[PDB]
Amino acid sequence: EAPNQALLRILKETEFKKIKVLSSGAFGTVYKGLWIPEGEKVKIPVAIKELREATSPKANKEILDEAYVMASVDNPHVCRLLGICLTSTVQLITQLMPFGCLLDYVREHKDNIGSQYLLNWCVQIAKGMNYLEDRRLVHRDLAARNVLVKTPQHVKITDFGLAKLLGAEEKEYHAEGGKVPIKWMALESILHRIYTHQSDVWSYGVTVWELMTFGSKPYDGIPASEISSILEKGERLPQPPICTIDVYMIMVKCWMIDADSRPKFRELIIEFSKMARDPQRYLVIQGDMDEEDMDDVVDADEYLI
């Protein structure tokens, strides 16, 4: 319905200096790097994505869909595209999230992550997701591995590789085949490939469950083909040790069968907020990056146009 007037910024390879792999694998490579725009006199820590080195018409069409989705979002809890680079190999350029992905970070820091932070991340992810819902956009791959950490106090949703904008008031996206992560999908997704803001809510549920168990693997063991039946029987993920029943009842709600019975992200914000005001009431936990002339460095969140 509304026209998407986002600007896509095309960036010169000369404008940015790579500085080391951060992750290789399926997709391709992600690099730490710096971006020095025009003459501006500002340097911008960036991450730079390159979906493998291979230039198969397949690959290139996908990375441009991300660029498309990422360029159209603008919210403190959603990762924004800074620009693309049209080298032989199409590069995605984004704000550097120096602490990496949230999944790895809870893992690597169990003995130091307190309730204030767990609940705050929950709120922040709810905000990201609520905003995505506003822009009528369905992520389809929300998971702890897809939330990045700019600072321990500030997280942002990423990985729009599967995100689908909902056209002519279409209330559910009917999907193809392809590899899809089962352990984070609503039931309507596994059975009917229906995806809706409310199936995003389910994945939220599981994401929250990853954070609360400090990075456990949902249904660890149980292999993927079993999942839809396990869920049909009525089984859900167990209550994490640190969780009060208040918090777990929120997860469980996100995992209901009737999609409209699940909470809305705007409600999830409210509830986790309340909870964030008294975190020890709601979680029971025992115990409760700069490397070369950094004079003109500015974080992307302060670089506007």
Ligand SMILES: CCN1CCN(Cc2ccc(-c3cc4c(N[C@H](C)c5ccccc5)ncnc4[nH]3)cc2)CC1
């Ligand atoms: C001590 C723990 N250890 C070291 C820190 N990390 C390594 C790491 C650091 C940064 C990142 C990172 C990825 C990333 C990122 N990747 C996404 C998928 C992306 C999206 C579009 C364009 C480029 C990247 N985007 C923005 N900032 C980012 N930062 C990934 C892994 C994890 C494990």
